[PDB]
Design a protein around this ligand. Structure first.
Ligand code: MLD
Ligand code: 3V5
Length: 349
């Protein structure tokens, strides 16, 4: 009589819902397979045209018992079998969020970023659950910026024209301490032109190169000796036509001798610490000459609008020869400052 097998065992508990459930017949074919929960409600499934295999086709629930009934028929007669199992019971759930967004074109410095809404106790599990495909294929690695957010990138800047596909398959995965993913997420993005803007404190010029060729030179005024602009590699983030930077958000009042409420135009963010390339009509005389800022890359209004218009998320700004230190690797936009042996060795433990 037909031989029935299933991907789950009768009486199992803690069965993970990261995978469909399947049933196979040998020495015959499946006539029908049904899988029901404890209220009698069927799980969607599909029988192969040949009749040799069946699978669930929709996500299974947490904390559920399921009963699986299968009948097979062959040139030996029939067999009908039944099994029940119980799925994982999470202590807690987290939902991942992945950047950059689906369909976007980004620059050559843009990492994959997966942020969870809860602390991740088993970083290795989260990594293994995240599948990144690249075309052309390129080696990269995971590194945690904090307890919630993991980044992935290659050793070198991405090559333009690279397709990146990201499947965060965290549904049904135990991410440590009984914390399971609430649901999978996907995204797909493309790497565009190589755009690297270099600000050299010896020239006070910000030179924007596309694919190695100069397209723009901007006089700049970067951070005063006292509040210097850090050297290193910065990843371009968000852009704002207009933004208000306000002392008293931290707790220094506007009406204090270090207070300010500054209207700023054409502002392209390049570190979570607060470095922007923006419009600085008030320091155009100092641009190309003398550092005057709190550590933003001050350029002229129309140079700032050019940057806002022509630089995208993931492009790169490199600062060199200033009196600051180096941008932290875990700034949020400072990933490329971590040397490759360290980045690749990761910090999953
Ligand atoms: N091991 C667990 C199982 O093992 C493997 C799994 O194979 C399992 C163990 C398997 O299903 N073994 C067969 C022999 C089996 O247990 N079949 C039962 C028959 C249960 C039974 O003992 N019935 C008898 C009924 C007749 C006698 C008596 N028991 C009665 O009816 O009272 C069924 O599907 O209902 C594989 N098959 C897939 C994916 O389809 C796959 O590769 C690794 C793993 O998953 O997981
Ligand atoms: C740039 O040097 C500054 C101004 C007033 O032009 C700059 C904007 C940022 S705020 C963004 N995040 C909060 N820190 C800060 C800075 O520290 O650079 N001041």
């Amino acid at each position: 009589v037909p031989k029935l097998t299933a991907s789950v065992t009768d009486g199992a508990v803690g069965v993970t819902v990261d995978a469909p459930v399947s049933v196979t017949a040998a020495d015959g074919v499946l006539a029908a397979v049904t899988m029901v929960n404890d209220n009698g409600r069927p799980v969607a499934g599909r029988l192969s045209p040949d009749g040799l295999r069946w699978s669930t086709t929709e996500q299974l629930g947490y904390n559920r018992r399921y009963t699986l009934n299968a009948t097979a028929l062959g040139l030996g007669g029939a067999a009908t079998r039944q099994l029940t199992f119980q799925t994982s019971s999470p202590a807690h759930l987290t939902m991942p969020y992945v950047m950059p967004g689906d369909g976007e074109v980004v620059g050559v410095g843009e990492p994959v970023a997966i942020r969870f809404d809860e602390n991740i106790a088993d970083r290795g599990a989260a990594e293994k659950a995240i599948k990144i495909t690249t075309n052309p294929p390129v080696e990269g690695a995971f590194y945690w910026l904090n307890n919630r957010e993991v980044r992935w990138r290659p050793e070198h800047f991405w090559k333009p024209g690279t397709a990146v596909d990201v499947a965060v398959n965290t549904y049904g995965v135990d991410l440590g301490e009984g914390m399971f993913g609430e649901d999978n997420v996907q995204t797909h993005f493309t790497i565009g032109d190589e755009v690297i803007a270099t600000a050299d404190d010896n020239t006070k010029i910000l030179t924007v190169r596309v694919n190695g060729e100069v397209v723009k030179s901007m006089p700049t005024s970067m951070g005063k000796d006292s509040t210097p602009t850090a050297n290193g590699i910065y990843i371009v983030g968000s852009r704002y036509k207009h933004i208000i930077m306000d002392s008293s958000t931290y707790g220094v009042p506007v009406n204090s001798p270090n207070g300010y409420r500054t209207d700023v135009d054409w502002a392209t963010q390049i570190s979570y610490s607060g470095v922007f390339v923006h419009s600085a009509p008030w320091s155009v005389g100092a641009q190309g000459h003398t550092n005057t800022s709190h550590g933003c890359l001050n350029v002229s209004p129309s140079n700032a609008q050019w940057f806002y218009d022509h630089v995208k998320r993931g492009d790169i700004v490199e600062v060199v020869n200033t009196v600051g230190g180096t941008l932290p690797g875990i700034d949020g936009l400072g990933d490329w400052n971590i040397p490759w042996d360290q980045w690749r060795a990761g910090n999953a433990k």
